[PDB]
Design a protein around this ligand. Structure first.
Ligand SMILES: CC1=N[C@@H]2[C@@H](O)[C@H](O)[C@@H](CO)O[C@@H]2S1
Ligand SMILES: CC1=N[C@@H]2[C@@H](O)[C@H](O)[C@@H](CO)O[C@@H]2S1
Lengths: 623, 623
């Protein structure tokens, strides 16, 4: 392709995106609306409102031509001034520089204005050697390189940090200078000057960036004011306490020229009678005066990944607008439920959230790709969800999602959606969130299978086996992303065999069938152990491709423990079969429902997303 | 031997104890002081104040004879009306019936009046299926059998339970009927009728026993009143809240005929300005009035395992005397610091505690054998400590500790004390508690060794190697306890190699010596891996001899994780050596002190006793 009207900067960006765009022998001229592309017979005119929108416009041109269109007539008016993707870099997976750059390229093509990294403790602060210690924290140079790459595409960069809670990986260090910063649990001590010193250190680090927009956190500080704070000061008004801390942090941000966003949940939890987020709260006048003074100094971010109807989001927006007009929305790219994402669920809720955002004058949507409890899901697992949100933002529909996605990823959208398969059990109601058999079927014990009442052995096993087959074929046409489909093919195959053995043991033991137990012990057990080893190897390839090495160690621990537990199950069965023991006491125990979260929806599967609770009923982190 | 004046019950006990006593062809006749033994020329008279003291008296006689005495003339007056041993059955290791019986025999010979088991959730309660689920909870029949065996020696049985906090293994269950019982963290909800229903269930279970003496717990409920309690009730006077709960619990106990003890720490924590135990107390007038009525109905147990001077204990007794004259003391049999006990430290503090308990006219001493953070230490690891407290109680000195211990165990006291060796680093000040390299040298990572600054790579390694040799010889002469010494011999040998390799890789990586890194990778790593496998096998034999199978699973997880991390370290080094990677980022990180707990003492070693924090700097239990 040849171009008129490009700047040298845009030339540079197009060189980097050529491998996606492959525009062929056409002439493009760059000259009201977010995006317009029009032309035919080898001549196309593109226009854009914000500079970064050039890259979605050119993706759209590419996708149209690739689909076989000669005449192209595209006009989009985006609903949101800003559309961001936030990757979790705090749940053990720290995105490596190469993968950050790739993600930025794809986001540029999709139409995102902004890239964000969620970093609790995973950046460096002067004279805080324990902050991010052995975590793969980003150096200032690494953050600058990521920011600068985004800026090459006229994209913004917004760090998402923590200035109150969600600092467990820092406050664990038994060092006087760290411990003195603590209130309780994962929460920093409000009113402690060494805490404001720390927070100023965070801003000093981020002030080395160009960006002056930041998310300061402040979600989920449930026991704020009730720890060392209570010992020092007695019981205080916790709503005002939050306001006080927030004003202190905004004052620090102001010193360095930053404008701030924060997660909004604590205002609602502190003012509602049952301490919940989804609540219309009455605000005491003294708190009102305080919030009224802070509403123009911070953007509140309403986060919600769960509702299946527009009206449910609308209610929360109305709750928020009683506090402030400046409300941003965070929607979900579901990749925090184990090893397997849920792009399908992401789509379902995004459609409805987008309706509510448009009704409530939202100017910014932040798509959050959390990594809860170890960061076991691929960083690129959620490309479909990210395209979905871009389509919703730009077109208000998903009519062109496949066409556009092919340019973004080089593979078919429906194929890519099959990455979800280890969560897509047959018969599951589609509107229930967090149902994650991919993870709990993997990590549950063999002898003491705590999730067994939530498994339909034949139906689920057949689904996993079918899924492995499907993904084995998809990985052969998945281009640069084949590795993530290989991981999923292996996981599904492993889950099928793991169910067969685990459920087979329960049945055979109850029947006293030592012949069948022997069959399992001597043939199926070696196979399962090898499949786990092979899965570990593939997962480690995936992780190293995407992430810094730090944090893989927790997954080694989890896999190594699973392997040792498979060996124990073999040994215990062999001792029973041989007559060395008269019973296997583990197998004499009645298995109970693991939880009742979805009892009243009546399905068999559930949500279970804490490894240490899946893997054992014994103590393991407590004293 | 031939016995005169025994009841049928006593005759049976003598038959059972012959294997210890070896009295031979003598006559013993059962006729002012706790114990008297008097005779010569094959005829001896014994007398006791309390029936169980018969068995210590016969031990004294046995020891005297084995020492070559013909004429024997021994009198003892015990300082304490009751002397108890409490084994932990809540830290994953649930003592099995055979081991309970053995322990009771030994305790009878030493002079203990009482056997106790500490059971948070590890017993059965009607209609509470999650209470002790997959934990190896005791059935009523099992507790009755254990109590009855104690009773055969005229020893009492006292269950030690929890009626407030330390219930993490129960409250983790995501079941509405469990979650509704919670305040915060590991604490039950005071004032909730369903909690009193649960507590009444506890008493219904224990009422099947003969004993009507019970320790109801109530230690370490630090955030009591601050969770769901606070949302429901506002901020209340927490010392009064404790009294209110206690009164409900005592009313329940009364209904079933029980007399109660409780740990005393929360009264001090809630009525000190620092919130600590070892503090003077400001007792509000209203709490005084409540305490004054409750003090007549409960025995407060002052627990302290740490002080090196009588005066420090005395100060605490004085403060306790502000609340009540009925104060029992809990001393320590140090077995909660990993895989290896500390009988030596136990001795040091017991000498001083015994002085304070005598000065303060204490009637009951309970020696506690906690098992913190997984129950990894043998249940029989602390027999020396138990003899020491018995000698202190009966004779106020340790002049006959060895002679009497030989009766109790069949083996030499100083040999048995060597079981401590993995904690007895050269140069350690003897008065510092909790220093536990046995555990943290084992579980620390190889690539990312978080405890490395606390390890002296030649000095400690030599000590572990020397200890392995010493223990290998002791195990050959240790009879029925050889297995616990074999575990220790293996552990010490493993720690020596593990240090050699971990420090060796830091050095060879630093000096760029790929040849030596390859030698380590190819020769030493497979050796270390095999040693860990073998140690796991030996530990598992030890565990199964002593405990129910439930809880071993956590240790399989921990060892499996370590094995996998050893494998990872080999693989990462191999990739570096072979040129597949240009650096090993793990080994480029500066290693910091792990904690500063003993920094003020200028110490290299430290205390580190939570597996999840030793093993990785990553997140592993948090979301
Ligand atoms: C703000 C937010 N705080 C929590 C995060 O720490 C989790 O990762 C996320 C997904 O479970 O849920 C909420 S969103
Ligand atoms: C009462 C007591 N409660 C605690 C126990 O849970 C621990 O096991 C023990 C040893 O660390 O220390 C105190 S004593």
């Amino acid at each position: 392709a040849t171009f008129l009207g490009l700047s040298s900067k845009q030339e540079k960006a197009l060189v980097r995106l050529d491998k996606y765009l492959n525009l062929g022998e056409i002439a493009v001229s760059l000259v009201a609306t977010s995006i317009k592309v029009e032309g035919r017979q080898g001549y196309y005119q593109v226009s854009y409102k914000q500079p970064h929108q050039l890259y979605r416009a050119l993706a759209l041109l590419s996708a149209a031509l690739r689909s076989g269109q000669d005449e192209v007539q595209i006009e989009e008016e985006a609903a949101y001034e800003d559309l961001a993707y936030m990757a979790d870099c705090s749940r053990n997976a720290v995105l490596n520089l190469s993968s950050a750059k790739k993600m930025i390229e794809v986001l540029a093509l999709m139409g995102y204005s902004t890239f964000e990294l969620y970093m609790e403790d995973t950046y460096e602060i002067e004279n805080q050697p324990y902050f991010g210690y052995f975590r793969g924290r980003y150096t200032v140079a690494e953050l600058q390189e990521i920011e600068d790459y985004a800026a090459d595409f006229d994209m913004s960069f917004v760090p998402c940090i923590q200035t109150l809670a969600h600092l467990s990986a820092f406050v664990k260090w038994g060092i006087k200078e760290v411990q003195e910063l603590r209130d309780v649990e994962d929460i920093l001590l409000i009113g402690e000057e060494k805490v404001y010193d720390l927070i100023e250190g965070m801003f000093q680090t981020m002030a080395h960036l160009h960006t002056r927009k930041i998310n300061i956190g402040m979600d989920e500080a449930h026991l704020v004011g009730l720890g060392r704070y209570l010992i020092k000061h007695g019981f205080q008004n916790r709503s005002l306490l939050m306001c006080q801390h927030l004003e202190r942090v905004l004052d620090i941000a102001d010193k360095y020229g930053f404008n701030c966003q924060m997660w909004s949940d604590m205002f609602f939890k502190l003012m509602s009678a049952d301490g919940q987020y989804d609540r219309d709260v009455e605000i005491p006048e003294e708190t009102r005066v305080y919030l009224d003074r802070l509403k123009e100094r911070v953007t509140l971010v309403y986060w919600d990944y769960y509702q299946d109807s527009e009206e449910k989001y609308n209610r929360n927006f109305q709750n928020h607008h009683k506090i402030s007009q400046d409300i941003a929305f965070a929607g979900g790219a579901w990749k925090w439920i184990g090893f397997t994402p849920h792009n399908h669920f992401s789509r379902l809720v995004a459609i409805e959230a987008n309706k509510a955002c448009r009704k409530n004058q939202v100017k910014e949507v932040i798509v959050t790709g959390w990594g809860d409890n170890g960061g076991e899901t691929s960083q690129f697992s959620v490309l479909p969800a990210l395209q979905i949100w871009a389509e919703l933002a730009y077109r208000n529909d998903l009519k062109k999602v496949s066409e556009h996605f092919l340019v973004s990823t080089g593979l078919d959208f429906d194929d890519f959606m099959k990455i979800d398969l280890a969560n897509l059990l047959p018969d599951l109601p589609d509107n229930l969130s967090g149902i994650n058999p991919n993870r709990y079927v993997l990590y549950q014990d063999v002898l003491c299978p705590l999730l067994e009442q939530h498994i339909r052995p034949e139906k689920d096993k057949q689904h996993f086996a079918s899924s492995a087959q499907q993904l084995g074929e998809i990985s052969k046409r998945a281009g640069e992303y084949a590795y993530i489909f290989e991981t999923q093919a292996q996981l599904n195959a492993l889950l099928a065999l793991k169910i067969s053995i685990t459920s087979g043991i329960q049945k055979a033991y109850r029947n006293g069938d030592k012949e069948h137990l022997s069959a399992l012990a001597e043939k199926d057990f070696p196979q399962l152990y090898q499949m786990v080893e092979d899965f570990s190897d593939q997962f480690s390839r995936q992780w190293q491709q995407e992430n810094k090495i730090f944090g893989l160690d927790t997954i080694d621990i989890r896999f190594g423990g699973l392997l040792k537990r498979i060996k124990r199950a073999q040994e215990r069965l062999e001792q029973f079969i041989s007559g060395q023991i008269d019973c296997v006491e583990e197998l004499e125990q009645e298995i109970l429902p693991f939880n009742d979260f979805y009892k009243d929806q009546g399905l068999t599967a559930t949500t279970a997303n804490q490894w240490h609770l899946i893997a054992t009923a014994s103590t393991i982190y407590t004293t």
